[PDB]
């Protein structure tokens, strides 16, 4: 009963276009394919804009005021968005491939590099109400005979430098009256001019060419004319300049060559501050901070994004995205981290809060098909088509074990015992389940009985029963543990593609090729419900398809499904452009999500394979925090979360309940009534007010008197609030009060409070323990130093 909204894209940090630093210098804006991602470097957080282009993005620019962000795709279609409120303002089509866009430092005007023409336009006023035609063109400039490589604004918003492929740099004047001030074309370079910049005084003009030559231009008597006073050459053996940026205040020149290495130079003395290589792929884009201390570099081939502190030679940010589509995903049991797998064969571990890759594992030779965590969460397991299963200890980030079959069986699915002592994998070629011992690494035995390739496996978290499904049109429940082992086969209408296990372990849901989600009772081995899927699925006709999409049977089934931890919903995905969220008890569609809107992707709308990228979701999973779910797709990991909560969803509301009345209970010191009434309104701002206004003395009294029905809500509110809140002692005092007062009730109903308790335990384990660990470490260091005898 929650609204999920796209929040951020993990798995890609840079794809193409130009990276731009926020004016304040604390945030970095990166185009990621069809969307733009913003990374908060100081706070170590990230988000991705919800607005979406028709095609991949080409260029981007943010105003110094930090209010207007313009994004233009490869077709020239522009989207103007408020940076502050993250909402689209206007759609404009420039009808031409714009190479670069840059706002004037005044912010009033913005210049477009459109082919061999420079277009300067007036910036819409954000404070004004929405206008239909806010874009008015100030001027169009037609001087270059070839496409413009890049453009640079003067610090005073009075002149613009543009470099074109005519081996020429030409300066204009923004004001018509000052046309005589700047109407000079600079020539002399033997290759394409990549950058033209002003000095801080703007007396000197620096121009750089692709060949690696830097010319310093000055206005002097031979009566006075611009001339090249000095010439500096980049003596790269074969590397060619691809991107250039210059900061006038500090006189820093950062140039990225095609060989994949960048050099930091001081102008005009041309001193090599530093030279580093990010790899063999070209350095696509380079940007400089306002202060000039952070340099952002990007390579499109491997999707690299690196922020460099050249002053201290430290790395603020260094991330690499998956080269391939992500085949599978797994959340850590607490949800603090998520692990992703790609067709390359490399696993990556990501922090949810930071949204950055903490480690990458490249032991697997071939594509990693599945990834799963143990119930403890310390260990992770993965299966790959190379024929191995590998166990990873995430506290020490080491592969402490590897499992393999006798004849190198290719594995596609993996499941692990909750006790973390048995691991089972399945294959498309053997029809048999291989079982290993985690402690020993030996093959215990192989579970036989399937006629078909095993498509999926899953252990019950509580009952530890193993459910296996196949293209055999059947499902088998294995009671492997115990003196005697039993198998209960249940036959199904069609080939099973996905299987999910209810957290209680009493039911099993499976997706079939017909497009049916059928739920079966494990103990009784009888069906309890069914959901239709064929109609709800959205599949777009492929450009190579000779058919109508309605007649197409390409993908009207879900290849992946998963329950909600609350257990009343299932998230399903497949080789299609739709994610459908179903309600199990009523068998209805809660909501459907469009995965992608990039017209480049095939499905959004004799020796050569006609092969192009397709929209598809490889795997889906609910966050254990019960606030988000992540879907692995070709672009990357799409995370939809319910954090915004702009919706008004009152519970047991009455006429007497009012935000003013809730405050009135507070000024009257009726804390319990205020807290209850706030929860009935279910307004977070009101709940936070009541929660922080309760004195510490009255917490135990309020805690003992909370009605049971509101108890699951308040425990959840504390857990998610506490994870980022600064009031640890206040929050812990609350949790102690609630736990001591209602501990028995929670034990009686573990499943009802399962998600709430887990969120609480995350806050106590991941931040609270870390604080005290430093505190107790400090205490013992003190006792050693003072008690101890001083050195001679």
């Amino acid at each position: 009963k929650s609204d999920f909204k796209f929040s951020n894209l993990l798995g890609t940090v840079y794809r193409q276009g130009n990276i731009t630093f926020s004016d304040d210098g604390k945030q970095l804006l990166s185009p990621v394919g069809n969307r733009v991602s913003v990374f908060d470097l100081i706070n170590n957080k990230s988000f991705t804009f919800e607005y979406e282009h028709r095609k991949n993005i080409a260029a981007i620019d943010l105003n110094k005021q930090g209010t207007l962000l313009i994004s233009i795709d490869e077709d020239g279609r522009a989207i103007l968005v408020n940076f502050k409120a993250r909402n689209v303002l206007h759609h404009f089509n420039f009808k031409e491939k714009c190479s670069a866009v840059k706002f004037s430092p005044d912010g009033r005007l913005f210049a477009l590099a459109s082919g061999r023409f420079l277009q300067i336009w007036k910036t819409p006023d954000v404070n004004k109400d929405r206008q239909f035609a806010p874009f008015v063109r100030h001027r169009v400039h037609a001087g270059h005979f070839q496409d413009i490589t890049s453009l640079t604004w003067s610090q005073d918003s009075r002149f613009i430098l543009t470099t074109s492929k005519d081996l020429s740099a030409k300066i204009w004047s923004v004001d018509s009256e000052e046309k005589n001030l700047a109407a000079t074309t600079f020539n002399g370079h033997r290759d394409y001019v990549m950058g033209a910049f002003f000095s801080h005084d703007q007396e000197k003009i620096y121009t750089v060419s692709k060949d690696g030559a830097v010319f310093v231009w000055e206005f002097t008597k031979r009566k006075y004319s611009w001339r090249i006073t000095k010439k500096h050459f980049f003596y790269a053996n074969q590397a060619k300049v691809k991107c250039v940026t210059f900061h006038p205040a500090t006189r820093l020149l950062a140039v990225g060559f095609t060989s994949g290495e960048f050099r930091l130079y001081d102008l005009p003395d041309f001193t090599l501050i530093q030279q580093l290589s990010m790899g063999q792929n070209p350095v696509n884009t380079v940007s400089v901070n306002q202060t000039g201390e952070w340099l952002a570099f990007g390579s499109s081939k491997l999707g690299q994004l690196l922020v460099y502190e050249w002053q201290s030679e430290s790395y603020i940010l260094k991330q690499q995205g998956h080269f391939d589509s992500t085949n599978s995903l797994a959340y850590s049991p607490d949800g603090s981290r998520v692990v992703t797998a790609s067709e390359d064969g490399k696993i990556k571990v990501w922090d949810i809060t930071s949204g950055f890759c903490l480690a990458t594992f490249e032991e697997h030779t071939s594509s990693v098909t599945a990834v799963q965590f143990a119930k403890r969460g310390q260990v992770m397991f993965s299966s790959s088509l190379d024929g191995t299963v590998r166990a990873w200890d995430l506290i020490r980030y080491r592969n402490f074990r590897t499992f393999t079959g006798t004849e190198r069986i290719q594995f596609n699915c993996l499941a692990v015992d909750p006790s973390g002592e048995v691991v089972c994998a399945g294959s498309l070629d053997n029809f048999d389940i291989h079982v290993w011992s985690v402690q020993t690494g030996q093959l215990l035995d192989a579970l036989s009985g399937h006629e078909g390739p095993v498509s999926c496996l899953s252990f019950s978290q509580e009952n530890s029963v193993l459910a296996s499904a196949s293209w055999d049109k059947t499902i088998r429940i294995w009671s492997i543990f115990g003196r005697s082992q039993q198998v209960e086969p249940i036959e199904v209408y069609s080939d099973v593609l996905a299987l999910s296990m209810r957290p209680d372990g009493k039911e099993v849901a499976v997706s079939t090729l017909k497009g049916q989600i059928s739920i079966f009772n494990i103990e009784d081995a009888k069906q309890v419900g069914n959901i239709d899927c064929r109609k709800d699925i959205i599949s777009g006709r492929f450009n190579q398809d000779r058919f109508t999409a309605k007649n197409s049977e390409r993908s009207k089934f879900f290849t992946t499904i998963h329950y909600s931890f609350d257990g009343m919903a299932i998230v399903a995905g497949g080789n299609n452009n739709s994610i459908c969220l179903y309600d199990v008890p009523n068998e209805v569609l809660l909501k459907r999500f469009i995965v992608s809107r990039n017209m480049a992707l095939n499905g959004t709308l004799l020796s050569t394979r006609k092969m192009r990228p397709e929209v598809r979701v490889t795997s889906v999973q609910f966050s254990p925090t019960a606030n988000a779910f992540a879907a692995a797709s070709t672009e990357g990991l799409l995370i939809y979360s319910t954090n915004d909560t702009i919706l008004f969803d009152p519970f047991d509301l009455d006429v007497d309940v009012t935000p003013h009345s809730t405050v009135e209970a507070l000024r009257e010191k009726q804390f319990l009534n205020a807290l209850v009434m706030a929860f009935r309104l279910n307004e977070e701002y009101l709940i936070n007010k009541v929660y922080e206004a309760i004195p510490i003395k009255e917490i135990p009294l309020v805690a003992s008197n909370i009605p049971a029905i509101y108890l699951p809500r308040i425990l959840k509110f504390i857990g998610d609030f506490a994870i980022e809140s600064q009031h640890i002692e206040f929050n812990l005092i609350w949790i102690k009060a609630l736990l001591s007062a209602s501990g028995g009730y929670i034990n009686e109903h573990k499943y009802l409070f399962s998600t709430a308790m887990r969120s609480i335990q995350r806050f106590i384990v991941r931040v609270a323990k870390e604080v005290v660990n430093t505190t107790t470490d400090n205490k013992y260091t003190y006792r050693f130093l003072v008690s101890t005898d001083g050195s001679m």
Partner: peptide, 10 residues
């Protein structure tokens, strides 16, 4: 001025 102008031991 440019027309683009502003305004051994021991």
């Amino acid at each position: 001025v440019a027309p683009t102008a502003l305004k051994v031991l021991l």
